[PDB]
Amino acid sequence: TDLTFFSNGKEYTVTVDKNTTYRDLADKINEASGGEIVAKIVNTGEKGTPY
């Protein structure tokens, strides 16, 4: 599939496969969108590490 984004009239697309991981996703987002779209994982400070 293709994660198609639209920021300030600028389109950005990211392909996703079966092996998708949140880290892989964030990296693909921050790379396809060359810094325009910020992607980052935060280790929520709760009991189940609800990232």
Partner 1 sequence: RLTLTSKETGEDSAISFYAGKKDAQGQYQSDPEAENIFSNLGWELDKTTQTIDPAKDKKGYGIKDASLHIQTAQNAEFTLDGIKMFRSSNTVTDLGVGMTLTLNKTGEINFDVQQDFEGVTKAMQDLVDAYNDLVTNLNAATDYNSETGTKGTLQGISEVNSIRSSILADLFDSQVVVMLSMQDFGLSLNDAGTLSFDSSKFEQKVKEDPDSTESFFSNITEGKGIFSKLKATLQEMTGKDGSITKYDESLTNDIKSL
Which one among 2, 11, 17, 46 touches partner 1, defined by CB under 8 A?
Answer: 46
DSSP structure string for 1-51? -EEEEEETTEEEEEE--TT--HHHHHHHHHHHTTSSS-------SSTT---
Which one among 34, 35, 45, 48 touches partner 1, defined by CB under 8 A?
Answer: 45
Q: Is 43 in the site for partner 1 (CB under 8 A)?
A: yes
Q: Is 34 in the site for partner 1 (CB under 8 A)?
A: no
Q: Is 51 in the site for partner 1 (CB under 8 A)?
A: no
Q: In angstroms, rounded to a whole number, what is the distance separating the alpha carbons of residues 28 and 39? A: 9
Query: Of the two residues 18 and 40, which places its CB atom closer to partner 1 in the complex?
Result: 40
